[PDB]
């Protein structure tokens, strides 16, 4: 299968036509996405198979072919870019200053950008182009819009 670093769409044919269920990151030969996109199922890349390696429903993250590789963190200060890959539309950078999710276990960066659910797993970047987490796990607010955590895993 294709193993070049970059951003990828996650597709299915189990519905009408070809439907985009979400997005992920290929880095150092490991595929990174959100748990709710694949539910831990195997993936095809051309005639190649990608098997799940690590996952956690609570973090809503999963890695394929290896351990989680992405370890960069939001600085807490600077704007970031969502590399949005929406269904049927070209990859597009959107630059934004994250807000904060305040939880009993700590503060997390959050991005207030509204995209279809099939955009889940798009990477959030810092100014050096490092993936600081994935978009698509968050909350619907007073206004009716979606606010996503910046969800990052840990690298062992």
């Amino acid at each position: 299968g294709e193993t070049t670093d970059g951003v990828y769409r996650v597709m299915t044919r189990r519905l009408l036509g070809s439907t985009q269920v979400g997005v992920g990151v290929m880095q150092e030969g490991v595929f990174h996405t959100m748990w709710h996109v694949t539910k831990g199922a195997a993936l095809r890349s051309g005639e190649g198979r990608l098997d799940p390696y690590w996952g956690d429903v609570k973090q809503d993250l999963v890695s394929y072919c290896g351990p989680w590789k992405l370890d960069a963190a939001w600085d807490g200060l600077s704007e970031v870019q969502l590399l949005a890959v929406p269904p049927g539309e070209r990859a597009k950078n959107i630059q934004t200053l994250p807000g904060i999710f305040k939880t009993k276990d700590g503060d997390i960066g959050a991005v207030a950008l509204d995209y279809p659910a099939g955009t889940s797993g798009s990477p959030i970047l810092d100014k050096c182009g490092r993936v600081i987490g994935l978009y698509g796990n968050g909350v619907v607010i007073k206004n009716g819009s979606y606010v996503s955590a910046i969800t990052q895993g840990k690298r062992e």
Binding site: G1, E2, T4, D5, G6, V7, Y8, R9, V10, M11, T12, R13, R14, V23, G24, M26, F31, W35, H36, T38, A42, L43, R44, S45, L50, V57, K58, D60, Q81, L83, V85, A91, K92, N93, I94, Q95, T96, L97, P98, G99, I100, F101, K102, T103, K104, D105, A110, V111, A112, L113, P123, L125, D126, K127, G129, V131, N137, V139, I141, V147
Partner: protein, 39 residues
């Protein structure tokens, strides 16, 4: 049966659409990985 398709390089892009606000929200995370608003 799910398959992947490359969509781009991961690159910062100088002068991209700048949008979105920066809300501070009290949230809870449940064992199913669902965030919810505390109030």
């Amino acid at each position: 049966d799910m398959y992947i398709e490359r969509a781009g390089d991961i690159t910062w892009e100088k002068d991209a659409e700048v949008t979105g606000n920066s809300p501070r929200l009290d949230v809870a995370l449940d064992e199913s990985g669902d965030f919810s608003l505390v109030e």
